[model samples]
Each structure stands twice: as structure tokens, then as C-alpha cells.
Target: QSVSRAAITAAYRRPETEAVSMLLEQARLPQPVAEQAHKLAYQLADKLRNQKNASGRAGMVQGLLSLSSQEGVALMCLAEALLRIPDKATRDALLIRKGVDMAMRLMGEQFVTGETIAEALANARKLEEKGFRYSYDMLGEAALTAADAQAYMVSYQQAIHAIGKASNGRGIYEGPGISIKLSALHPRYSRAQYDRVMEELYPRLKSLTLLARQYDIGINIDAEESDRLEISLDLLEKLCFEPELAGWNGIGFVIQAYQKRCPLVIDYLIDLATRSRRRLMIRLVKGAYWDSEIKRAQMDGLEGYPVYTRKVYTDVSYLACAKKLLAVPNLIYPQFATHNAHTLAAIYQLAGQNYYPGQYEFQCLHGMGEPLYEQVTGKVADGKLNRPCRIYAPVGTHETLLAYLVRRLLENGANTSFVNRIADTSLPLDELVADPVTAVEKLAQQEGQTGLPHPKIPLPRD
Candidate 1:
């Protein structure tokens, strides 16, 4: 039989995949700790999902929190409720805020997430021993001023230096490297700031690129909004022109599948890789900033939105774009960063038929895709492993985590997200795994209009 989508439901974990993911992503959880978290999360999710309005929602939220039980359901429930309610009355919001604060503090003590490189080192050491690789991202953003830009640069440099020292050679993927946001390092980072961006940005980016080479760990420049596309490409090209960095294959960039120009971007990067002679590393992701991408596009009164209206459209686009990356070898090394089993399975199927093993690797958030990865890597399920797997983790203080953490909830907690829906028994298995090309072709094309309802719990735009 053809690989069916039913396999996807069977593919991931039991319910609470996202909750366990939150803790697992921070670091390993103690058995009792994990079990208690799972139990409390189940209870809270059951209640939270059943609530029909703001009152019901806040009440459900109001009841789940406990004053002193740090490891119990308070954090998960609070996070879920926060994802549900963006704005609440002073009392209701304060109640939820306390839960968020407590959760962050508890997370800090468990070493689940890190603000410092020292904390990252501790986590990486543990991951390395498990035969998994790492990608460390400093958890901060939005350069408010020149000082903010300089401080971020210094912090990233410190991250690069620490990551270099921490690469004990125990992992599989070449990166125990760091990920950087161009927006974070420059105050005037918009595409509108063209003439000045080159002068202000690359000098900082070049410094990080040099440190990455010295350490031998790879760096993947993260994908931001559609508006900043030119800035990313132009800045990257100039850095490579330094000749010293021209041959360094350690640099990379990401392309979000949701964008309309994804296919063209893939071709451009591949051509650029060939012409530049420095291997262009490209990471593929189902865009995270969907709400913002749409909202901004709408607010700007742009001719059209840059992202797909339907989730399925993006899925199809992902495979279509992935196919382009796979067909061309040596020009670009593809990193398939996703938590969906169907996507992973499709990539594995493609690898079996087209690309050689090790030509690409599958990635998931540090704490996500446990069951799926184990099955693919042969750590569990089938004895046959697929290929190397890498973990994308953010190291930052808990206070900084709210920005990162809330967005993660919006990404995973959204009703329509693959991570949130992979285990939903009500979905049509056939529709879920049906060929994206066929699926997308059958649908009408246009402005983020799959007629999909907006999620009741608002998606946070980062």
C-alpha cells in the first residue's frame, strides 16, 4: 500500500507532544518531573480546549494554577492559557502572568533553557553524549538603538566563541554552530535602509563569519520577513567577497516555504552557490511568522501577500522547493528543518531515490519530534536509521524566553499547525498525506484565503 497519512498520527507521539517538547527542548526532564508535567498538561489542555469564551477561558485558566507546585500543571496550563488569551483584565492577566513567571523560574532551575553560553554548554554536553548535534541561537531581537545593535553583536560574538570552545567533537552534524538574525545586529536593518545597511551590517556579520570559520562550526543566517530578502542576500554576498571567507562553506541562509518567491529563491541560491563556489547551505522551514506576514501585508496595502493562504499550500510548496534543492547537488546542502513526519518521510523517500545519504539532514526543535526522530534515526521503531538529525535550540535567560517562548506557543499551539494537529484523530489521513502538488493544484490560488478561520488563540508576531 502507498504510505498513508494514517501513518502520521501513528507517526508522532501521544497527545502532549508539544508540552513534552517544551521541556525536552529546554533539556532533559526527570522521569517523575516529566510524568507530572504530562499529567497536569493533559488536565489543563482538556479544560482549556473546552472553554468557549473569554470568561470561560479565563476561568479555566484561573482554576488550574497552584501557588507552590512548580513542577506540576501551572506552567503548561498558564502557557496554554496565555496562548489562548492575548489580552485579559488586570486581575485575569496578572493571574496568568504569575503562572508564566513561575513557569520561567522553574524552567530556569531545571536547566531546560539557557540565557548564558555556560547553560548552553551544559545542555550541549548532554546532547552530544546522546549522539545528537546542536544549533545554538541567542534569544533576543529588535535593535532599538545603536547601543542595542552593538550589544547584540557583542553577545553573538560571545556565543560564537563559546560555541567554538564547546564543540567537543562528540556530535554528528558539523554544527554545534550558532544562528544569527541580521535584524538583531543592526538598528537600521530594513530594506528601505539600503544604502546604509551594507555599510552598517556586513562589518558585524563578517566578524561572526570569521569566528565561525576559526571554530569550524557552521552558521546559518536566519530568514526574517519577505521585505528583508534583498538585505540578506546582498549582505551575505559582500561578506563572502572578503576572499578570506569566500572559500568557507560554513555560512548558510534559510528560505521559508510559505513565501510566493520560494522556488525562485531556491534557484537563485543554487546558482549563487555554483557561481560563488562557496557551498550555500540552505535550511527549509514552514514559516513561523504566518500571522505577522499576513497582517503586515494587509496593513501595508500591498498588492498581494507574500505567504500562502493555506497551510496545505505551504506544505506543497515545501516539497516542491525541497525537490529543487535535492535535484541539484554540490551547489547547495539542504537542511530539512521540520517536525512533521509526513514531511520527514517524504524527504527520506526522496533521499532513497535521488540524493545520497549525508547529502542532507532532518532537523526539529531541540525538544520536538522525539518519536518521529527516533523512528527515522533507528534509535527506536525500525532498526534502519535514515540519516543524521540536528537540534535547533535557543539559549537565553527566562525573561528573554517570553518573547521566544510565547511565539513557540503560537507556532505549536495554533489549531491549524502541523505540530498541533499531527495527532488529531479527526483529520482526514488521506488529505494530510495526499501529494501537495495535486492538492495545491485543485485549490484556488490567492491572498492567504483558504477560508481558514483565524485561530481563537492569537498567533504572536515576532
Candidate 2:
């Protein structure tokens, strides 16, 4: 029932196909439930397919990211480097009307909500009235200096005050929230600095969490790289048990299902929640750092990669972990965050039809999610299911926008990305939403293999 850090580490290098098969029983949906999920998913996909002007903001960004043309490549290079040029005048000019127009053309409006917290809150208010909730992420990366961390802290403090004021006393669960990157709060947020992190980073984290608590708004700790997982969990454990934060259930954390130890992590979280007597909000994402995770493991020449080699394996892990989270609804508030329609359908069906307020909620990126979630939330054509969805909106200036959007582009632009695959009309809908467990099994049988890494990818040692 309980899990240990050692158990989590032991599964890090476990073979892909074998891991998928191991979790198949727990991950599998009942036949009837699966049929319902498929029916719902098909309707959603069909609407997406038949909808006029198929290329929305998400599609446009996906097109830019495809990089098939030299123009696309040039735009991507410019967008990626524009923010880091270190020329204040040049960057300021880009914020002017004409330059802003060009930036929007290069990167879509779908990538970010606004340049500042006030702007983002105004946007979020319109959506809130339309039955959409939001979790704003102040866009930036790891701090290089103590000053950088201090600046981020100030930005976060201001955002929380604005968000809370706008929330107008709506309780944490229903109100707008903030998602924070742990690395942004510390200059050296790594295992090597664990002792220092506790001494230095911990106070800053506690202060931020306490501020959110004061405002009665949700504050979620965003997940980062593979190496930081255990250490972050350490921080989370301390945060959860802090007597000052004891009764607030608004504290949330994100778990990336791409890691082999995801299920075990869920186990650890549940145990922690039970022991601490706190209901932690847990957002489950397919993960955003896959390409880098693979590269870093190879560069370090580790014993094995911490993440799964194939995309389907990650999908399987996601559903399996979803099952665990849904099972213990009392222990944790499960936030299913994904852009994939199939995943959304599976979670919807797995959660069952009896909808009560706060039973569970869905989440997606701000602009990219509007169309799909428009169908999910409020009245729909099918009229059978109306679920709640929270938009994960990013608020940042153009300086921080490009690098952030580029990372998003790379993550969702891959061939295996559901959004990318959905845009390809040539593929059948059935194949797009196929059962990942079945897919993995079929792959294993075809190769007459067990737990083999992808053929194209070499072992780190190799």
C-alpha cells in the first residue's frame, strides 16, 4: 500500500514493454466503459475534424513548428533567440504594435494569455464566467543568480494578490490558481545543494505557500526534470506537514507520467497525504520534458534512462497512474491535465457518470484547449457529460514568451504528439485513439521481444 524512494528508483530503468504489460490489468478499462469512452472520443474527434476552419491557434502553431519550409525554420530560429539577445532596445521594439504583430505571426496568440498578471486576470475573468477555471503560470526558467530568484519571488507575490483579489472570495477549489516552477525560486535547486535548498529554498517556498494560503487560492508546484524528482518530493513532504499549512487543501503538485516510477510516486504521495492529514491537489500530466530527459540521460551515461523510450508506454503509464488517483479520491484531488482527446475520454469514462461538484476536474493549456474544452464543459451536442476543466494559462512578456512557446512547440510538435497526429487527416480516428496497452502488446509480439528499447535509440553506454 505504501511505497519507498528505493522502490521508485528501482523502476527507473525497467524495460518499456514489460512495464506496460505489468500495469495492463490496472490500466485496462471495462469493456462497457471502454465502449463509452470510444463513443465519446469519436464524437469529439469527428466534431474537431468537421469543424470549419480546422486550423485554429493550436493548429497554426503546430504548422509553424512542423518546420517543413525554410521560412518556418527562419521564424523558429528568430523566435527562439529573440528574447535572449540582451539588447533592451531591440527587445522593447518587439513589444511595439507592429513588432508585436510580427511576433504573434511567428508565435500564435494561443501560446500565452498576456504580458502581465492584470492582463491575464482580465482574460481569465471572461473565461471564468463561461464556466472555465484557470491556473496561471508566470513564465520563466531556472534562476542563474540570487537576484533572479528574488525577482521571480516578487513577480509571484504580485500575481497571487491580483489572482486572489479577482477570485472574489471564491474558495481555492473553484477559484483561479497559480502554478510555480520550483527551480525558479532557487539559484541552485539541485540534489548537490539539498542541504542548502532546505536552508535557503525552503523558507522562500514556505513564504509563497503561506501567502497563497492567506488568500485562499490554490498553489501548485510544477514538475521539472527527472533528476529533481526525489528532491522535489522531499520539499513537498516538508511543505505538506508544515503545521502552519496544516488545514488548507489548496496545496497542489504535478506528477509527470513519462517516468517509469510514476505509479510508485502516486503511492508515495497518497501515503504522505494520509500521514499528513491533508488533501493535496495532484495534477497528472504526460510530461513536457521528454526530449531533454532522453538527451540528458545519454549525456550523463547513466545505467539506464529514467523515462520510457516509447510514447505509448508513457500513455499506458498515464492511464495506470490515473486509475490510482481516481481510486483514492478522498486522499487526493485528481486533476487530469492532457491535450489528447483519447486521454480525456478515458479519464472521463474511468471517473464514471455520476458528476458532483469537485469530484474531479480536467485541465488543458489555455488557447489550445478552448475548442475541445468548449465541447467538454457546459451544454454539448451529446449532452451526456458536462465536466469542469481548468485552463493552464501562461503570463509573461515577449522576452520570456519565445523560449517557453518553443519548448511547447517541440513537445507537442513531435510526430507522436496527439495534437500533431490529430492535425494529420490521413490517419484514421480509430488508430489515433487506439488502446496503448494493446499497441504495446502488439509491438512486443511483432518483435518476438520483451522489454527491448526502441531500435533507433541506442543505450546510453553505447
Candidate 3:
């Protein structure tokens, strides 16, 4: 099992016990919290066993507040851990959420408002002033009704407008782009109903895309879960092929490397770019819906989720996809959104060999892998390497941030082999029995604030 920079950073940030305790405390009362914890643990164990089965080996390893009691507790634990690891602006962007607001007000009394379009724009401007780019996302997902979806769309439109207007003065108005989740656009609706929503959104999104291109702002359509991927791709195709959006350099699409169909999808996207005569900006990521994907597949009696059962497979897939994206002539910019060092190295190598200069780049979650971010960007800035990069800086109220944090943690924890490896390697025999947090802190301190210590074993390559 390979550990991502984000996972390692999370392990270093908070102790396992602290993470467990945080969840238990944040969760409502005794029995329910205990039950949920047990369930989570069990699910994690299942994931581990499955991973082992797939790899045929053992390896070391490495969010919404609107959630139900169990989910809320789980999310809180994840958020708390993430806040401890620090990264650059790119990583920070992904951490934005609605729940962050309440958490900050209650805990620190520091106020930052962005629930409205104007407020969000103001926040984006502040971030821009700090030398960070922005990707505006509306908070909610998994809408319960068509009406809710419409409301979410309206909010997205308002956000797009505000972001566009704010960027006008800087002469880089398109640097800020809106992120939309299809489920929030229409989850429970009929296919036609969902299509209608896309039909409505694509035109407006196209207009926004055109405005962004005119000003050099970039638009990226985020990847959702497997169930909704078909529709998501359909919408992406529609947007990419829009006559107005064609020849526009700013429009892009996100592809999850974890999905079984991701490679095919990448090829399809490349073809779409060629046919449309537009440049492609692809944001490649490890899929986010591990548990949900597996559970949904099981419930639906599918063979298995279309994901690699082992970490190496996913890592390899990520590298392969990154290479493919870089190799494409129509691809103007590609965002390698990952914290895996090996994969990152592969991307760097590909870019160097191809000599694309700043045309290709890397991205990672904020508050995670701070050291790695510095290493990469510092190298690039100093002419040690040649490529551009950005960190996703998520700035929202504590509640919103926490919600995003929780989802991240739960996903990491669910990968049992990853957690076990980190737990085992985090300390030496003499320190193994010590508190996990203290052990990690000691190790990190010993490793110093600079480069990562060499891995104990050779990393697998696919």
C-alpha cells in the first residue's frame, strides 16, 4: 500500500487516539456514537481485507456538517486531523465548506462571511490579493428534490457572475471558476429531468466559460461519484463542444483516476478536444467516493466498484493518466491533483522530457503536504524545475472546513492497510507503545522540517 502526502501529513498532524476521541466526543451521546464507530471500524476492516486480496500482499499505509449523527461525528474527526497538516493555496481551496463558518465563530470568534454571492466574491478577492487563485463551489450536494437542485443552480450562477465581475479589474477575471456537483444540480430526478438541468446549466456555464476565456480565467467541471458519471460526462461533452466554448482555452474537465473507466474516459475527452478544436484542461484526481461507491455497488449487486482494489493500481493509473494528458496536443493545461510523491515525480519527469515548460502543473489539497508543496514550487521558482503549480486553498467558516476535513479523513481511515502501515512505521520499537500523536510528532521532529526521510521499502511501480 502506498501512502499519499495528504495521508502522511494527516497521520503526522493528529494522533490516532485523538482522531478516535474527537469523533466520539463530537457525535451525539453514548450508544449511537459507539455504534457508528464500530460500524466504521468494521467497514474499514473490510476495505483493508479487500485491498490485501487485490494486491496479494500487505503494505504500509497512510465532510459535511449537515451530516446525520454518525456522519457528523465522522466528519468532525476528519476535519480536525486535516487542520493540523498545512499546505499551500491549492490544497486549501478544496477544504472550503459551509460548516467552517459555525466552527470558527463558536471556537475563535473570528468572522468571515461568504454564504451570499457578494460575500463569496469579497472572500475570493481577499484570497487573490494574497497571491492565491480561487475555485468557487456552492456548499451543498445530494439534493433531495428538483427544486433544491434549481436553487443550487441559481446559487452557482450567482457565484459565477460575482467571480467574473470581481476578476474584471485585475485583467484576469477568469482565474476564478465555479465548481458544480451534478447531484446538487438534480440527484433524485428522472434522467430527462437531470438532462433538463444540464441543458439549462450548459448554456449559462458556456457563457460563463466564454467570459472566463476572454479574460483568461479557467473553468473546470468537477468529477462526481460513479452513479452520476454518465450524465456528468454527457454534460461535459455538451459544454466542451459548445460553439461559443470552442477554441476557448479556459474550459476543462476533471477525471477520477480511480474509476475503471477513467482511461477510456480520458481517451474520449482527448477525442472531444480534437473534434471540438479546443484545448483541454484536465484535473486528474484519485476518486473521492470509495465507501459510497463500494456500498452502492454492493447494494446494486454489481460485481464490484470500478476501482483498483490496491493502492498501487490507483497510483499507477494516476501516473498513466497524467502522462496521457501531457502527451495530448490539444491539452493546453493539465492539473495533476494528487499528493503521491511517486506519481508527482512521474509527472515532473514527463513534463521535463517533453519540455512543456509551464504548460503542465501539479495541484494538491491545502493544509496537507506543506513540505512537499514548498519543495515542488520552490524548485520550480528557483529554476530547479520548469512547470507551474497551484494549491487549493479552502477558506470558509470552521464548520464548512470541518465538513470537508471529515470526508477526507473518513476516506483515509477506511483504507485500513494504510492506517496500519502508518501506525506501525510511525514509531520505533522503543516508541511504539507511546501515544500515537507524540510518536508521530517525535518522528516528524526527528525528520526535521525539511525533506521526507527515505522510505523504508522500495515503492512499487506499475
Candidate 4:
């Protein structure tokens, strides 16, 4: 069952129906298990709905996006393109037109946890009594110069020191961890700069990782774009096998299930872990770069996209990968990062009834996850699921916050997004938590369209 990178990329543009059906076969649960999962999802969704502060700022974003008007479209476009616009005058004009007051208010308190690691750790403590852990993400990426990269490196190192001291020798699984982006450590972090990335970026990463290891706290490598997948893997393989880094299971990676190559990535990682004799912490996410991935493929005139067109397809892929990760706890520590009630419920059931402190953990963004996870992280006797959840808290100033905020807005603002959908009381809970596998199957059978790749969204070349 060893899959090659060529095989991974080959499926990038494969027909959706075929790919979904194949994914369903791997992701499907037995009849009883499916029913149980559905039942649990219903309960989780119900509790979340009853919470007054569940979505918070997300509810505001959802309401704004739901408005079918010029304002809504303008806001979405502004948020998505704000970071990329180079002209300061034009950027200021756009921000003013969009009303910076509301934008800043929204992003200031919720989306970003803190402007510094010290502040974020203090915020994390407020939730520690509720059985919550934290993973601090120092956000500043796409480094354009050695100076920028060097600055980011110092920030990461400083955050590690702060987080390590706060963790107080709690070890990798229980303590607060740091999530690093490879792009932030090097100016040239792309496939085209393979030589420079391996030669220069590897040392920067190793130095930071060694620092994290000194603290015995976890350090997870965040997922980037599809083209950088192999290069990241190459770097990870080197790190995993390095003699100094041996026997440490704190090394982690975030895997994006939206990519067509997700399963293959897992396949390769499992082999790599076995070969290196190290257990990797795997954070399974539905991905945040979906829209850009589509646009990039079309602009490049690639044969097909590297991501799934339909959101449900990504959901199916996520569950399949979750099952794969859950099955091999010895080789990988599965950290399910999601805001979907159904996904949370399904993973809970999939992990089985016998739960332990470190069996598997759930993760959610700092602002969005608190309400829902408050209900999930406590003990079962208190009517809670007794599960562990790590809050993905972003530590940065406004200048460093734009990229992260844009990604969050783009990923969760869509009507199809679970965060948006869950806030609307009009949608029935059953429909909200409906199984993605079954949904995709029905799509395949409807009108004899075996594997349609979104009728409205034609291939880029088309």
C-alpha cells in the first residue's frame, strides 16, 4: 500500500465522482457505527446551538456574508486581497471604505489571541481549569528577505522560551506547544528553490526544533500549499532521522485533507515514521487555502486542481484520514482540528468508548472553539465528553495578523462553511450533521452523473 508522489499528483485532477466513491469506500463506517456517530453529532450540535456565545465574531462574519448585496461582496473581496495589495495608499483606501472600525474590533479580540506569547499564555491559563491545552502559532510568513526570515526566527525562538517556561515541564502531549511555518523561516521556501530550502531552511528549522526539544514541548510544522508538499516531506524526513532528534515524538505536522494528495501524504508519513522509529503528532485539518488553490490551478492552466471542488468531498477525505491516523496511534498522534460538530462527534465515536488522557485530542481556533469545546473537554459524568482539546492560538501584532485573519475569513466566511452554517438556526440539525459519504454517493447517482466536478465550476482550462 505504498503510494508514490507521482501517484499523489496524478489524482490531483481526477474526476470527482470516482475520487469520492473511492474515498467513501475507505471512509465509510458500519451501519451501526454510522448511526451511533450521527446520534452523537446531533447531541453535540444541539449543545452548541444552546450556547449563547458559540460562534461570537464568526456569527458577525456569517451575518455579513449572508447579505446578498454589493456590501457583502465588497467586504469578501477586500478581506481576501488586502494582504496582497502592495500599494499602501490603495490598501488604506480599501480599509477605510470597508470601515476599519468594525474590521479591527472583530479581529482585535477574537481572531487573534494576543499580540505577544506572554499575553496568549495568560489567556490560555484562563481555560486550563476547563481541561484545555494550547498550541501557540507565531504568524509571519512568505519571508521576502534574509532579514525578514531572521526576524521571524527570533520571534519563534522567543515564543518557544516563553511557552516552554509556562509549560513547566509538562512534556509534549500535556504542555502547550508551538506551531511553526516553514515559509516563515526562509525567503525561498518553494519548490523552485529546492536547493536553497534544503541547504538553508533546514538548519533554521533544526535549530528551532532543537530548542523545542530542550523544553520537551511539542513543535508542529504547519501545512502550506500543494506544490510545497514534497519539499516539506523531504525536510521532515531529514529532521525525523537526525541523530540529535532521535526518540523524540514531539515533532509534529499539519496535514490538509482538502488536497487530493492527503491520503498519499499520510501513507508516506507512516512509512517515514516507521523507518525513523519515531511517532509524529499529526494535526488533521480540512485546509484553509481552498479558494486560492482553485484560482492558482486555473491561472497556471494546470490539467486539474490539487484540491477538491466540493466541500463535502474534503469532509469525506478528512474522515478517511482521521480513521487512518486513529488506527495507528503508535506511529502518529492524531490531533483533529475542526469546528464542525458532526466531525467532532464522528471522531469521538470513531475513537471508541475507551478513552484515556492522551488517546487522541481535538483542536479548535482560540476564538471559535471555546464555547463548543467547553462542552466537549470536561468529564463525561458532568455531561461532557471528557475529551482533550488544544486551542490554536495565534500570537502576533496587527502587522503580522493580516495573513492569518484573511485565511480565517476566507475559509470560514463561506455559506458552505460549518461555522457559518451552524450559526443559522433555520437549518435543521439532522441536515447539518448529515454524513458526507452518503451525500457524495447521492450526488454521484443523481441524474446518472457519475463523477461531476461541480457543474458550475468548470475546470480551469475549460
Error of 2 at 279 (Å): 0.9
**1-462 per-residue lDDT for model 3 (tens digits):** 112222322332232223323322221223443344344333333333343353223221112234466766686688777786677564477645445555444533222235465766665454344334556655666667768767766766666666677666443222665565656666463343555757665555565567666556566677776655666666776777667665666776788876656656766776667767877777888777665655554566543345544444454456556667777755546788765443454455555445543466666554443334444553445532333444444434443344355456664455332333323333232221122223334444785531122243111220
Stretch of 10 with least lDDT, candidate 4: 50-59
- Give Cα-based local distance difference scores for all models: 0.64, 0.83, 0.52, 0.85
List candidate 1 segments past 4 Å from native.
Answer: 1-112, 168-175, 188-192, 353-357, 378-384, 428-432, 441-462
- 2 or 3, greater by TM-score: 2
lDDT tens digits, residue span 170-270, model 4: 99998999999999999856544778888899999999999999999999999988888878888998899889898989999999999888887888888
- Reference-based TM-score, model 1: 0.71
Which of the two candidates, 1 or 3, achieves a greater lDDT against the reference?
1
Choose 1 or 2, whichever is better by TM-score: 2
Whole-structure CA lDDT of model 1: 0.64
TM-score of candidate 2 relative to the true fold: 0.87
TM-score per candidate, in order? Answer: 0.71, 0.87, 0.60, 0.88
Best by lDDT: 4
**Which has the higher TM-score value, candidate number 1 or candidate number 3?**
1
**Candidate 2 residue lDDT tens string, 317-427:** 899999999988788999999878889999998987676768788999976778788788775555535788899999987656665776777866799988888777767
User: Would you give me the overall lDDT of model 4?
Assistant: 0.85
Best by TM-score: 4
For residue 153, model 3's alpha carbon misses the true position, in angstroms, by: 2.4
* Candidate 4 off by > 4 Å: 1-3, 52-105, 188-192
Candidate 2 lDDT (Cα, whole model)? 0.83
